[PDB]
């Protein structure tokens, strides 16, 4: 039952940089270690096995080192198609254990989100369902918290988020949170608010509206 610890959890870098992801095992696993690439929505790709053996076909820019308890994956000359999540893996004859993953992203300057809130459409409300949408636009880095409050009561379990991939142009992310309520619930309360906390904001921003305007 070996514990695998990757470091760092998020690694921000620029094209052309040379970076090193570390994987530490809680007890010696000799050289039984493999490294994998994974792209959002896609299957993992095997990059390295036996700690340092490069799989046929994998570009020579990837190189793996380490042994015992400490292992490193080094990418010398980071390219664009290399921005992805990397997983280390202890593989045994009949089982395996993975690290938590390391997300490699494009480095840029912190940028606070622009926050917008959208009441439900009259059409939807009439159909018996109320979706309220909170938009966080073009922010960096990816970590942000969005909390819904309905008449100052914190909401839990009734919202969903979706995050975009790093934007091709400004290297920012955008996020959508949708709060879903029954028509009756929505009409039982008046003030709807979404509170956004983010590293680029001096303090949290709360956007709100009154039902009926």
């Amino acid at each position: 039952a070996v514990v695998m610890t990757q470091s760092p959890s998020t690694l921000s870098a620029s094209v052309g940089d040379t970076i090193t992801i570390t994987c530490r095992a809680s007890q010696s696993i000799e050289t039984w270690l493999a490294w994998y690439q994974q792209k959002p929505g896609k299957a993992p790709k095997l990059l390295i096995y036996k700690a340092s053996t490069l799989k046929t076909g994998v570009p020579s820019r990837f190189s793996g080192s380490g042994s015992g308890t400490e292992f490193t994956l080094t990418i010398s000359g980071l390219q664009f198609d290399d921005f992805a999540t990397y997983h280390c893996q202890h593989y045994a004859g009949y089982s395996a254990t993975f690290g938590q993953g390391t997300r490699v992203e494009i480095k840029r300057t912190v940028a606070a989100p622009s926050v917008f809130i959208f009441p439900p459409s009259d059409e939807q409300l009439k159909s018996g369902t109320a979706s309220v949408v909170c938009l966080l636009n073009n922010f960096y880095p990816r970590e942000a918290k969005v909390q819904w409050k309905v008449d100052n009561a914190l909401q839990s379990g009734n919202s969903q988020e979706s995050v975009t991939e790093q934007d091709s142009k400004d290297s920012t992310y955008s996020l959508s949170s949708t709060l879903t309520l029954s028509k009756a619930d929505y009409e039982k309360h008046k003030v709807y608010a979404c509170e956004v906390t983010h590293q680029g904001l001096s303090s949290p921003v709360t956007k709100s509206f009154n039902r009926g305007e």
């Binding site: 896609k42 299957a43 095997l46 096995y49 799989k55 997983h87 893996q89 089982s95």
Partner: protein
């Protein structure tokens, strides 16, 4: 060339069961130890299960031992994953991976993966019923519609059981929504309307839900 594809992913309610399968193209599984792995919403991979050649060994992640069973069918090149007593934290993308290398050794990494199939466990394991009147208007008929509950069964009595003659409680139907619905009706004297009171008592033991509903004319 070598390909895998998983089938069977879907949305399941907590405690339910779901079976996934995995097929391949351009190789035979017979010589390969086959594995299941899942990617949790945080983004990390979790090893889930392994089954060796000849089904000699089956190994599971501690989180799933006792609930999941893996099987292999070498003759048709399929692998199966039975998931029972499913929990919210089983929600993930499931991948089917083979252990392999250009030359097979006793311990090769996972060199080929399927694209994945999304498995989602919704948090609510039950849902209490909504009850609506079927309002009447010599022989009159009235009743209650017990709608949108899960799982079965519900029990229905009328006036805490005092009214039994003429009562019919129908088998529930499974709506396209994945929730059940049934109706219970009673036939009564056309002159009992406004004088004798009628209240249907719905019990949904799985969700400890009790609902009393007065059915009056209009």
């Amino acid at each position: 060339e070598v390909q895998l594809v998983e089938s069977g992913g879907g949305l399941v309610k907590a405690g339910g069961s779901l079976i996934l399968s995995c097929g391949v193209s351009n190789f035979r599984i017979s010589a390969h130890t086959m594995n299941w792995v899942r990617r949790v919403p945080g983004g990390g991979l979790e090893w889930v299960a392994s089954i060796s050649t000849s089904s000699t060994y089956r190994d599971y992640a501690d989180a799933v031992k006792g609930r999941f069973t893996v099987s292999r069918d070498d003759l048709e090149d399929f692998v199966y994953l039975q998931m029972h007593k499913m929990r919210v934290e089983d929600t993930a993308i499931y991948y089917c991976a083979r252990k392999g290398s250009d030359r097979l050794s006793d311990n090769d990494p996972f060199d080929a993966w399927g694209p994945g199939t999304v498995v989602t466990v919704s948090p609510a394991s039950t849902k209490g019923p909504s009850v609506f009147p079927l309002a009447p208007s010599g022989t009159a008929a009235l009743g209650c519609l017990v709608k949108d509950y899960f799982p079965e069964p519900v029990t229905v009595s009328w006036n805490s059981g005092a009214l039994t003659s003429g009562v019919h409680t129908f088998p529930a139907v499974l709506q396209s929504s994945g929730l059940y619905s049934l109706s219970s009706v009673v036939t009564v004297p056309s002159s009992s309307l406004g004088t004798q009171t009628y209240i249907c008592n719905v019990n949904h033991k799985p969700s400890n839900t009790k609902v009393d509903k007065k059915v009056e004319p209009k």
